């Protein structure tokens, strides 16, 4: 019936909204901030500088705000930001940024990060993502809204996981995953679009069909990527949903003068 | 040398047989019941309604009987049941069931579940299994007696792992695995039968042979599953061991009226 | 600020050099030696007999020194040895040896072992190695100096990972990785040599070229291993760096009288 367990350790410099809860044997280190309504389980380690928003649930054996062990990082003061309404399940690791990117690891709102997931330095997670058990973002990975990374999905540094994209269990992602796309295997290859994601968002059935077509343009017609982007111009102007897709491919590929 | 560490937390409503041990900083939650001579390590978390049987050994950092995070599950009073003589190693996660199935995750007797493995909601495990480090049953997975899942084996929802079957390390299993079959890879593919295990269980020469022939019927003679089953009916009447194999195949493949 | 937290448990048979630190809720079991300047985080479990050198850092939720659960192990008094200047990150498991090999798991100096990495019974790791998150040495694995195992690399028992070798993420290694070689995928396959490694170690550019040719000899040229071994003798006499590669291939393939 008492919010901060007396067997937890709270740095004087940490700053908790009053109705925060911290379970027994949890450490809330210096420079950690925790928002209205957040619940910290038993045996959690928070290190900062780290800003956690409201209504987060962080489960046992999680390390949130540790330094990345990557030799690149040499002790510079770098940040972790986690938004509102996230659930961080048991044993998750989330590391702070590195000064060679934007010095921040960033998690939005309403995400579900399942047991043993790992969220490496400088990674950016948007909103409503699901990282299933043991998903690992190596570093500087961007995961846009509604993405679902199935169990034990691995993501190479710098890859972008597009909105509503979906990886199958054990996927090893080496390159960007365009919005809506489903990918499978080691290495990750594209199979289809996430029609289920599209239903659950109540996408019009013209938009669902347009996105099937945009898939075929990119993947099943021998277009080069530059050829696909050009063909997609029309659909992208017709349908905001296709434009999200065109844009995710556009961002992955600048190229070099040939 | 006093069985329940005073540094542990034991809910009033927990039920511990007389000679149970509980290490320090371990939580035995409400509606958790533990049988004779079971040993709980330190830093274990137990949540209920959970019933754990006799002579089990649960290692540090395990979270046994927690709710699945799956959005489908809505806080209902589902259960976990663990039998006798199991060994659950460091960091294992085991979740209670969901009302959509039978409201019960179930583990039998004499199993070895190694570090960081995950036993998803509604999974049923038989007896004498080995889940090696980081094996992950996504949900509603049935693992029949003596099955060995090598390290980092992933099993998709609703899959049945047959008696005596074997998965190689990093297998990504997405369809049922019949009794005795060895599977490998991502996605998992059948390679042989688990003769090592047949030897250990003291199978006759004749039975080991019958099982090799039965493998050849299903996997190496162009037969459909329907034709393979027909061909096995004889071998299955002659050898209990083959019948286990015939039945594992039967109950994967109900089919649709063509 | 007391170097040993009063909330930690220290066996009287443990021997700590004077400026050892142990965080809260850590256990240092019987027969654990910890060298000068080492730091044990909170929530660590150390079991013995184990010998840990100078200036190591072991992080929260790590279990270092436990028994392997492999059923061949029968409680014999096997050992774990860890040199100096290693970093063992959140949740690593390291198991002691088995009497059927040398009764010792062994780790050298300046290694980096990242979250949830698993160092199985009897493994031998040299110096300046990096095992990224979730790397798993199943048992009796030899890793030689400067090797890099990317995230979720799995290594089959008895495999030798060669000096400066490199595995890509999700690699499933069933066989020896010769020095400098890069391998990828499940099953793991050779692709190139770890030129980046050779750079960072100041190799002559003649030696880098000699190691590229040596690769071509072994992998890209029809040769049997015995044929490649014989072609490499000249190159191995000219360049110590090549000799290390010849020797990794030598000491992998004894063969049988045919
Ligand atoms: N709330 C939710 C939610 C949403 C999507 C998923 C995705 N999901 C189911 C799926 C894959 N393809 C079709 N359905 C998996 O990740 C299974 S793998 C796994 C699962 C759990 C633990 C360990 C492992 Cl390994 C899972 C959960
Ligand atoms: N008691 C036992 C017992 C039985 C079977 C196995 C199966 N096993 C060994 C094997 C594969 N093929 C032939 N023998 C593995 O899982 C190796 S992988 C691994 C192993 C350990 C940790 C991490 C990892 Cl990744 C392992 C142990
Ligand atoms: N110090 C270092 C160091 C050296 C090599 C590697 C190897 N490396 C790539 C890399 C090169 N530089 C930065 N990162 C990976 O393992 C990526 S996978 C991964 C990574 C991290 C968590 C989970 C996963 Cl899955 C990684 C780090
Ligand atoms: Cl059409
Ligand atoms: Cl098509
Ligand atoms: Cl059933
Ligand atoms: Cl025959
Ligand atoms: Cl054949
Ligand atoms: Cl040349």
PDB file of C-alpha atoms in Angstrom, chain B:
ATOM      1  CA  UNK B   1      20.420 -23.408   7.000  1.00  0.00           C
ATOM      2  CA  UNK B   2      16.739 -21.996   7.374  1.00  0.00           C
ATOM      3  CA  UNK B   3      14.479 -22.869   4.569  1.00  0.00           C
ATOM      4  CA  UNK B   4      12.661 -19.601   3.704  1.00  0.00           C
ATOM      5  CA  UNK B   5      15.160 -16.720   3.638  1.00  0.00           C
ATOM      6  CA  UNK B   6      13.920 -13.861   5.810  1.00  0.00           C
ATOM      7  CA  UNK B   7      15.001 -11.601   2.901  1.00  0.00           C
ATOM      8  CA  UNK B   8      12.372 -13.190   0.621  1.00  0.00           C
ATOM      9  CA  UNK B   9       8.731 -11.947   0.337  1.00  0.00           C
ATOM     10  CA  UNK B  10       6.039 -14.657   0.816  1.00  0.00           C
ATOM     11  CA  UNK B  11       2.432 -13.585   0.233  1.00  0.00           C
ATOM     12  CA  UNK B  12       0.125 -14.545   3.125  1.00  0.00           C
ATOM     13  CA  UNK B  13      -1.981 -16.404   0.515  1.00  0.00           C
ATOM     14  CA  UNK B  14       0.922 -18.568  -0.845  1.00  0.00           C
ATOM     15  CA  UNK B  15       0.999 -22.271   0.212  1.00  0.00           C
ATOM     16  CA  UNK B  16       4.499 -23.835   0.765  1.00  0.00           C
ATOM     17  CA  UNK B  17       4.974 -27.549   1.667  1.00  0.00           C
ATOM     18  CA  UNK B  18       6.982 -27.991   4.847  1.00  0.00           C
ATOM     19  CA  UNK B  19      10.605 -28.376   3.498  1.00  0.00           C
ATOM     20  CA  UNK B  20      10.509 -25.895   0.544  1.00  0.00           C
ATOM     21  CA  UNK B  21      13.506 -23.570   0.294  1.00  0.00           C
ATOM     22  CA  UNK B  22      13.324 -19.993  -0.921  1.00  0.00           C
ATOM     23  CA  UNK B  23      16.444 -17.935  -1.428  1.00  0.00           C
ATOM     24  CA  UNK B  24      16.863 -14.279  -0.560  1.00  0.00           C
ATOM     25  CA  UNK B  25      15.118 -11.453  -2.551  1.00  0.00           C
ATOM     26  CA  UNK B  26      12.770 -13.980  -4.180  1.00  0.00           C
ATOM     27  CA  UNK B  27       9.039 -13.140  -4.302  1.00  0.00           C
ATOM     28  CA  UNK B  28       6.422 -15.853  -3.871  1.00  0.00           C
ATOM     29  CA  UNK B  29       3.248 -14.025  -5.015  1.00  0.00           C
ATOM     30  CA  UNK B  30      -0.401 -14.463  -4.064  1.00  0.00           C
ATOM     31  CA  UNK B  31      -2.028 -17.780  -5.077  1.00  0.00           C
ATOM     32  CA  UNK B  32       1.381 -19.464  -5.679  1.00  0.00           C
ATOM     33  CA  UNK B  33       1.522 -23.024  -4.323  1.00  0.00           C
ATOM     34  CA  UNK B  34       4.856 -24.983  -4.037  1.00  0.00           C
ATOM     35  CA  UNK B  35       5.380 -28.711  -3.268  1.00  0.00           C
ATOM     36  CA  UNK B  36       7.706 -30.721  -1.062  1.00  0.00           C
ATOM     37  CA  UNK B  37      11.489 -30.266  -1.443  1.00  0.00           C
ATOM     38  CA  UNK B  38      11.184 -27.731  -4.258  1.00  0.00           C
ATOM     39  CA  UNK B  39      14.044 -25.225  -4.044  1.00  0.00           C
ATOM     40  CA  UNK B  40      13.607 -21.613  -5.145  1.00  0.00           C
ATOM     41  CA  UNK B  41      16.890 -19.799  -5.772  1.00  0.00           C
ATOM     42  CA  UNK B  42      17.562 -16.146  -4.938  1.00  0.00           C
ATOM     43  CA  UNK B  43      16.161 -13.272  -7.101  1.00  0.00           C
ATOM     44  CA  UNK B  44      13.350 -15.547  -8.407  1.00  0.00           C
ATOM     45  CA  UNK B  45       9.906 -14.028  -8.991  1.00  0.00           C
ATOM     46  CA  UNK B  46       6.778 -16.285  -8.766  1.00  0.00           C
ATOM     47  CA  UNK B  47       3.324 -14.967  -9.708  1.00  0.00           C
ATOM     48  CA  UNK B  48       0.025 -16.931  -9.514  1.00  0.00           C
ATOM     49  CA  UNK B  49      -2.387 -18.589  -9.772  1.00  0.00           C
ATOM     50  CA  UNK B  50       0.499 -21.067 -10.123  1.00  0.00           C
ATOM     51  CA  UNK B  51       0.932 -24.568  -8.716  1.00  0.00           C
ATOM     52  CA  UNK B  52       4.560 -25.948  -8.642  1.00  0.00           C
ATOM     53  CA  UNK B  53       5.029 -29.619  -7.618  1.00  0.00           C
ATOM     54  CA  UNK B  54       7.792 -31.447  -5.748  1.00  0.00           C
ATOM     55  CA  UNK B  55      11.595 -31.498  -5.971  1.00  0.00           C
ATOM     56  CA  UNK B  56      11.864 -28.635  -8.521  1.00  0.00           C
ATOM     57  CA  UNK B  57      14.947 -26.336  -8.633  1.00  0.00           C
ATOM     58  CA  UNK B  58      14.235 -22.789 -10.018  1.00  0.00           C
ATOM     59  CA  UNK B  59      17.367 -20.622 -10.574  1.00  0.00           C
ATOM     60  CA  UNK B  60      17.924 -16.906 -10.025  1.00  0.00           C
ATOM     61  CA  UNK B  61      16.313 -14.245 -12.354  1.00  0.00           C
ATOM     62  CA  UNK B  62      13.434 -16.534 -13.502  1.00  0.00           C
ATOM     63  CA  UNK B  63       9.927 -15.002 -13.675  1.00  0.00           C
ATOM     64  CA  UNK B  64       7.499 -17.959 -13.475  1.00  0.00           C
ATOM     65  CA  UNK B  65       3.686 -17.394 -13.662  1.00  0.00           C
ATOM     66  CA  UNK B  66       3.715 -13.754 -14.908  1.00  0.00           C
ATOM     67  CA  UNK B  67       0.878 -12.683 -17.324  1.00  0.00           C
ATOM     68  CA  UNK B  68       1.686 -12.945 -21.060  1.00  0.00           C
ATOM     69  CA  UNK B  69       2.098  -9.418 -22.506  1.00  0.00           C
ATOM     70  CA  UNK B  70       0.055 -10.586 -25.599  1.00  0.00           C
ATOM     71  CA  UNK B  71      -2.660  -7.890 -26.180  1.00  0.00           C
ATOM     72  CA  UNK B  72      -5.236 -10.783 -26.578  1.00  0.00           C
ATOM     73  CA  UNK B  73      -4.987 -11.560 -22.794  1.00  0.00           C
ATOM     74  CA  UNK B  74      -7.087  -9.147 -20.665  1.00  0.00           C
ATOM     75  CA  UNK B  75      -6.162  -9.824 -16.959  1.00  0.00           C
ATOM     76  CA  UNK B  76      -8.363 -12.984 -16.499  1.00  0.00           C
ATOM     77  CA  UNK B  77      -7.552 -15.457 -13.640  1.00  0.00           C
ATOM     78  CA  UNK B  78      -5.762 -18.153 -15.790  1.00  0.00           C
ATOM     79  CA  UNK B  79      -3.198 -20.630 -14.295  1.00  0.00           C
ATOM     80  CA  UNK B  80       0.264 -22.225 -14.557  1.00  0.00           C
ATOM     81  CA  UNK B  81       0.927 -25.820 -13.418  1.00  0.00           C
ATOM     82  CA  UNK B  82       4.458 -27.246 -13.056  1.00  0.00           C
ATOM     83  CA  UNK B  83       4.921 -30.906 -12.087  1.00  0.00           C
ATOM     84  CA  UNK B  84       7.685 -32.705 -10.159  1.00  0.00           C
ATOM     85  CA  UNK B  85      11.514 -32.881 -10.530  1.00  0.00           C
ATOM     86  CA  UNK B  86      11.930 -30.083 -13.131  1.00  0.00           C
ATOM     87  CA  UNK B  87      15.040 -27.923 -13.378  1.00  0.00           C
ATOM     88  CA  UNK B  88      14.373 -24.320 -14.509  1.00  0.00           C
ATOM     89  CA  UNK B  89      17.666 -22.407 -14.979  1.00  0.00           C
ATOM     90  CA  UNK B  90      18.735 -18.803 -14.812  1.00  0.00           C
ATOM     91  CA  UNK B  91      16.434 -16.096 -16.278  1.00  0.00           C
ATOM     92  CA  UNK B  92      13.687 -18.473 -17.565  1.00  0.00           C
ATOM     93  CA  UNK B  93      10.280 -16.806 -18.206  1.00  0.00           C
ATOM     94  CA  UNK B  94       7.104 -18.938 -18.038  1.00  0.00           C
ATOM     95  CA  UNK B  95       3.681 -17.318 -18.406  1.00  0.00           C
ATOM     96  CA  UNK B  96       0.198 -18.382 -17.331  1.00  0.00           C
ATOM     97  CA  UNK B  97      -2.400 -19.266 -19.999  1.00  0.00           C
ATOM     98  CA  UNK B  98      -5.177 -17.259 -21.719  1.00  0.00           C
ATOM     99  CA  UNK B  99      -8.991 -18.012 -21.614  1.00  0.00           C
ATOM    100  CA  UNK B 100      -9.009 -18.403 -25.479  1.00  0.00           C
ATOM    101  CA  UNK B 101      -7.330 -21.865 -25.034  1.00  0.00           C
ATOM    102  CA  UNK B 102      -7.725 -23.907 -21.726  1.00  0.00           C
ATOM    103  CA  UNK B 103      -6.629 -21.077 -19.319  1.00  0.00           C
ATOM    104  CA  UNK B 104      -3.475 -23.075 -18.388  1.00  0.00           C
ATOM    105  CA  UNK B 105       0.214 -23.267 -19.224  1.00  0.00           C
ATOM    106  CA  UNK B 106       1.229 -26.810 -18.178  1.00  0.00           C
ATOM    107  CA  UNK B 107       4.634 -28.412 -17.438  1.00  0.00           C
ATOM    108  CA  UNK B 108       5.076 -32.086 -16.544  1.00  0.00           C
ATOM    109  CA  UNK B 109       7.953 -33.840 -14.727  1.00  0.00           C
ATOM    110  CA  UNK B 110      11.782 -34.304 -15.108  1.00  0.00           C
ATOM    111  CA  UNK B 111      12.196 -31.455 -17.591  1.00  0.00           C
ATOM    112  CA  UNK B 112      15.364 -29.388 -17.989  1.00  0.00           C
ATOM    113  CA  UNK B 113      14.614 -25.826 -19.093  1.00  0.00           C
ATOM    114  CA  UNK B 114      17.925 -24.004 -19.531  1.00  0.00           C
ATOM    115  CA  UNK B 115      18.910 -20.321 -19.144  1.00  0.00           C
ATOM    116  CA  UNK B 116      16.756 -17.613 -20.687  1.00  0.00           C
ATOM    117  CA  UNK B 117      14.304 -20.065 -22.326  1.00  0.00           C
ATOM    118  CA  UNK B 118      10.709 -18.809 -22.651  1.00  0.00           C
ATOM    119  CA  UNK B 119       7.546 -20.872 -22.200  1.00  0.00           C
ATOM    120  CA  UNK B 120       4.744 -18.824 -23.710  1.00  0.00           C
ATOM    121  CA  UNK B 121       1.137 -18.726 -22.518  1.00  0.00           C
ATOM    122  CA  UNK B 122      -0.842 -21.984 -22.950  1.00  0.00           C
ATOM    123  CA  UNK B 123       2.214 -24.129 -23.835  1.00  0.00           C
ATOM    124  CA  UNK B 124       1.945 -27.780 -22.656  1.00  0.00           C
ATOM    125  CA  UNK B 125       5.229 -29.613 -21.865  1.00  0.00           C
ATOM    126  CA  UNK B 126       5.302 -33.352 -21.133  1.00  0.00           C
ATOM    127  CA  UNK B 127       8.036 -35.179 -19.245  1.00  0.00           C
ATOM    128  CA  UNK B 128      11.844 -35.575 -19.624  1.00  0.00           C
ATOM    129  CA  UNK B 129      12.201 -32.717 -22.193  1.00  0.00           C
ATOM    130  CA  UNK B 130      15.319 -30.477 -22.564  1.00  0.00           C
ATOM    131  CA  UNK B 131      14.769 -26.894 -23.766  1.00  0.00           C
ATOM    132  CA  UNK B 132      18.359 -25.609 -24.242  1.00  0.00           C
ATOM    133  CA  UNK B 133      19.350 -22.002 -23.577  1.00  0.00           C
ATOM    134  CA  UNK B 134      17.004 -19.386 -25.101  1.00  0.00           C
ATOM    135  CA  UNK B 135      14.507 -21.878 -26.622  1.00  0.00           C
ATOM    136  CA  UNK B 136      11.279 -19.887 -27.094  1.00  0.00           C
ATOM    137  CA  UNK B 137       7.766 -21.424 -27.309  1.00  0.00           C
ATOM    138  CA  UNK B 138       5.698 -18.488 -28.672  1.00  0.00           C
ATOM    139  CA  UNK B 139       2.310 -19.810 -27.340  1.00  0.00           C
ATOM    140  CA  UNK B 140      -0.026 -22.858 -27.276  1.00  0.00           C
ATOM    141  CA  UNK B 141       3.007 -25.069 -28.066  1.00  0.00           C
ATOM    142  CA  UNK B 142       2.798 -28.787 -27.137  1.00  0.00           C
ATOM    143  CA  UNK B 143       6.147 -30.537 -26.450  1.00  0.00           C
ATOM    144  CA  UNK B 144       5.756 -34.302 -26.010  1.00  0.00           C
ATOM    145  CA  UNK B 145       7.943 -36.512 -23.784  1.00  0.00           C
ATOM    146  CA  UNK B 146      11.802 -36.648 -24.351  1.00  0.00           C
ATOM    147  CA  UNK B 147      11.884 -33.826 -26.946  1.00  0.00           C
ATOM    148  CA  UNK B 148      15.204 -31.955 -27.175  1.00  0.00           C
ATOM    149  CA  UNK B 149      15.067 -28.364 -28.523  1.00  0.00           C
ATOM    150  CA  UNK B 150      18.681 -27.199 -29.092  1.00  0.00           C
ATOM    151  CA  UNK B 151      19.801 -23.641 -28.086  1.00  0.00           C
ATOM    152  CA  UNK B 152      17.846 -20.673 -29.489  1.00  0.00           C
ATOM    153  CA  UNK B 153      15.125 -22.938 -31.023  1.00  0.00           C
ATOM    154  CA  UNK B 154      12.047 -20.758 -31.816  1.00  0.00           C
ATOM    155  CA  UNK B 155       8.587 -22.457 -32.035  1.00  0.00           C
ATOM    156  CA  UNK B 156       5.630 -20.664 -33.650  1.00  0.00           C
ATOM    157  CA  UNK B 157       2.199 -20.514 -31.928  1.00  0.00           C
ATOM    158  CA  UNK B 158       0.160 -23.786 -31.905  1.00  0.00           C
ATOM    159  CA  UNK B 159       2.990 -26.012 -33.194  1.00  0.00           C
ATOM    160  CA  UNK B 160       3.322 -29.563 -31.720  1.00  0.00           C
ATOM    161  CA  UNK B 161       6.891 -30.877 -31.057  1.00  0.00           C
ATOM    162  CA  UNK B 162       6.633 -34.751 -31.202  1.00  0.00           C
ATOM    163  CA  UNK B 163       7.986 -37.196 -28.597  1.00  0.00           C
ATOM    164  CA  UNK B 164      11.784 -37.875 -28.934  1.00  0.00           C
ATOM    165  CA  UNK B 165      12.048 -35.190 -31.614  1.00  0.00           C
ATOM    166  CA  UNK B 166      15.158 -32.951 -31.888  1.00  0.00           C
ATOM    167  CA  UNK B 167      15.723 -29.364 -33.090  1.00  0.00           C
ATOM    168  CA  UNK B 168      19.230 -28.183 -33.987  1.00  0.00           C
ATOM    169  CA  UNK B 169      20.568 -24.894 -32.683  1.00  0.00           C
ATOM    170  CA  UNK B 170      18.826 -21.796 -34.009  1.00  0.00           C
ATOM    171  CA  UNK B 171      15.987 -23.784 -35.649  1.00  0.00           C
ATOM    172  CA  UNK B 172      12.895 -21.628 -36.452  1.00  0.00           C
ATOM    173  CA  UNK B 173      10.064 -24.179 -36.310  1.00  0.00           C
ATOM    174  CA  UNK B 174       6.826 -23.049 -37.993  1.00  0.00           C
ATOM    175  CA  UNK B 175       4.977 -26.334 -38.618  1.00  0.00           C
ATOM    176  CA  UNK B 176       4.599 -29.428 -36.394  1.00  0.00           C
ATOM    177  CA  UNK B 177       7.657 -31.654 -35.784  1.00  0.00           C
ATOM    178  CA  UNK B 178       6.731 -35.328 -35.765  1.00  0.00           C
ATOM    179  CA  UNK B 179       7.898 -37.819 -33.137  1.00  0.00           C
ATOM    180  CA  UNK B 180      11.681 -38.682 -33.425  1.00  0.00           C
ATOM    181  CA  UNK B 181      12.296 -36.285 -36.336  1.00  0.00           C
ATOM    182  CA  UNK B 182      15.429 -34.062 -36.288  1.00  0.00           C
ATOM    183  CA  UNK B 183      14.857 -30.584 -37.848  1.00  0.00           C
ATOM    184  CA  UNK B 184      17.372 -27.774 -38.595  1.00  0.00           C
ATOM    185  CA  UNK B 185      17.507 -24.218 -39.925  1.00  0.00           C
ATOM    186  CA  UNK B 186      15.349 -21.149 -40.432  1.00  0.00           C
ATOM    187  CA  UNK B 187      12.867 -22.051 -41.586  1.00  0.00           C
ATOM    188  CA  UNK B 188      13.241 -25.528 -39.927  1.00  0.00           C
ATOM    189  CA  UNK B 189      13.485 -28.594 -42.313  1.00  0.00           C
ATOM    190  CA  UNK B 190      13.490 -32.338 -41.445  1.00  0.00           C
ATOM    191  CA  UNK B 191      16.887 -34.139 -41.877  1.00  0.00           C
ATOM    192  CA  UNK B 192      16.706 -37.546 -40.092  1.00  0.00           C
ATOM    193  CA  UNK B 193      15.256 -39.245 -37.012  1.00  0.00           C
ATOM    194  CA  UNK B 194      16.765 -38.953 -33.494  1.00  0.00           C
ATOM    195  CA  UNK B 195      18.463 -42.386 -33.334  1.00  0.00           C
ATOM    196  CA  UNK B 196      20.672 -41.131 -30.409  1.00  0.00           C
ATOM    197  CA  UNK B 197      17.530 -40.851 -28.287  1.00  0.00           C
ATOM    198  CA  UNK B 198      16.093 -44.199 -29.449  1.00  0.00           C
ATOM    199  CA  UNK B 199      19.409 -45.802 -28.303  1.00  0.00           C
ATOM    200  CA  UNK B 200      19.245 -44.008 -24.894  1.00  0.00           C
ATOM    201  CA  UNK B 201      15.605 -45.237 -24.355  1.00  0.00           C
ATOM    202  CA  UNK B 202      16.782 -48.824 -25.185  1.00  0.00           C
ATOM    203  CA  UNK B 203      14.634 -49.299 -28.338  1.00  0.00           C
ATOM    204  CA  UNK B 204      14.988 -52.658 -30.116  1.00  0.00           C
ATOM    205  CA  UNK B 205      17.087 -52.914 -33.319  1.00  0.00           C
ATOM    206  CA  UNK B 206      13.835 -53.817 -35.201  1.00  0.00           C
ATOM    207  CA  UNK B 207      12.066 -50.650 -33.924  1.00  0.00           C
ATOM    208  CA  UNK B 208      14.928 -48.258 -34.793  1.00  0.00           C
ATOM    209  CA  UNK B 209      14.875 -49.766 -38.362  1.00  0.00           C
ATOM    210  CA  UNK B 210      11.044 -49.488 -38.580  1.00  0.00           C
ATOM    211  CA  UNK B 211      11.358 -45.796 -37.692  1.00  0.00           C
ATOM    212  CA  UNK B 212      14.045 -45.205 -40.352  1.00  0.00           C
ATOM    213  CA  UNK B 213      11.712 -46.810 -42.935  1.00  0.00           C
ATOM    214  CA  UNK B 214       8.807 -44.694 -41.639  1.00  0.00           C
ATOM    215  CA  UNK B 215      10.932 -41.561 -42.114  1.00  0.00           C
ATOM    216  CA  UNK B 216      11.603 -42.724 -45.717  1.00  0.00           C
ATOM    217  CA  UNK B 217       7.790 -43.206 -46.316  1.00  0.00           C
ATOM    218  CA  UNK B 218       6.940 -39.633 -45.153  1.00  0.00           C
ATOM    219  CA  UNK B 219       9.910 -37.600 -46.455  1.00  0.00           C
ATOM    220  CA  UNK B 220      11.817 -39.423 -49.281  1.00  0.00           C
ATOM    221  CA  UNK B 221       9.279 -41.301 -51.519  1.00  0.00           C
ATOM    222  CA  UNK B 222       7.140 -38.467 -53.113  1.00  0.00           C
ATOM    223  CA  UNK B 223       4.082 -39.606 -50.985  1.00  0.00           C
ATOM    224  CA  UNK B 224       1.567 -36.900 -49.876  1.00  0.00           C
ATOM    225  CA  UNK B 225       0.913 -36.932 -46.103  1.00  0.00           C
ATOM    226  CA  UNK B 226      -2.424 -38.805 -46.773  1.00  0.00           C
ATOM    227  CA  UNK B 227      -0.533 -41.536 -48.739  1.00  0.00           C
ATOM    228  CA  UNK B 228       2.328 -41.715 -46.140  1.00  0.00           C
ATOM    229  CA  UNK B 229      -0.252 -42.308 -43.365  1.00  0.00           C
ATOM    230  CA  UNK B 230      -1.937 -45.075 -45.374  1.00  0.00           C
ATOM    231  CA  UNK B 231       1.500 -46.762 -45.956  1.00  0.00           C
ATOM    232  CA  UNK B 232       2.467 -46.491 -42.216  1.00  0.00           C
ATOM    233  CA  UNK B 233      -0.778 -48.225 -41.001  1.00  0.00           C
ATOM    234  CA  UNK B 234       1.091 -51.590 -41.022  1.00  0.00           C
ATOM    235  CA  UNK B 235       4.418 -50.455 -39.370  1.00  0.00           C
ATOM    236  CA  UNK B 236       2.137 -48.602 -36.813  1.00  0.00           C
ATOM    237  CA  UNK B 237       0.348 -51.847 -35.853  1.00  0.00           C
ATOM    238  CA  UNK B 238       3.661 -53.785 -35.538  1.00  0.00           C
ATOM    239  CA  UNK B 239       5.596 -51.192 -33.466  1.00  0.00           C
ATOM    240  CA  UNK B 240       4.190 -48.933 -30.733  1.00  0.00           C
ATOM    241  CA  UNK B 241       7.217 -46.677 -31.505  1.00  0.00           C
ATOM    242  CA  UNK B 242       6.081 -46.137 -35.133  1.00  0.00           C
ATOM    243  CA  UNK B 243       2.481 -45.570 -34.016  1.00  0.00           C
ATOM    244  CA  UNK B 244       3.697 -42.586 -31.931  1.00  0.00           C
ATOM    245  CA  UNK B 245       5.234 -41.302 -35.190  1.00  0.00           C
ATOM    246  CA  UNK B 246       2.113 -42.122 -37.273  1.00  0.00           C
ATOM    247  CA  UNK B 247      -0.134 -40.311 -34.698  1.00  0.00           C
ATOM    248  CA  UNK B 248       2.123 -37.164 -34.505  1.00  0.00           C
ATOM    249  CA  UNK B 249       1.712 -36.842 -38.322  1.00  0.00           C
ATOM    250  CA  UNK B 250      -2.107 -37.619 -38.246  1.00  0.00           C
ATOM    251  CA  UNK B 251      -2.919 -34.822 -35.765  1.00  0.00           C
ATOM    252  CA  UNK B 252      -1.058 -32.019 -37.657  1.00  0.00           C
ATOM    253  CA  UNK B 253      -2.978 -32.527 -40.933  1.00  0.00           C
ATOM    254  CA  UNK B 254      -6.824 -32.532 -40.487  1.00  0.00           C
ATOM    255  CA  UNK B 255      -7.316 -30.692 -43.835  1.00  0.00           C
ATOM    256  CA  UNK B 256     -10.230 -29.088 -45.739  1.00  0.00           C
ATOM    257  CA  UNK B 257     -12.781 -30.868 -47.950  1.00  0.00           C
ATOM    258  CA  UNK B 258     -11.267 -30.534 -51.456  1.00  0.00           C
TER     259      UNK B 258
END
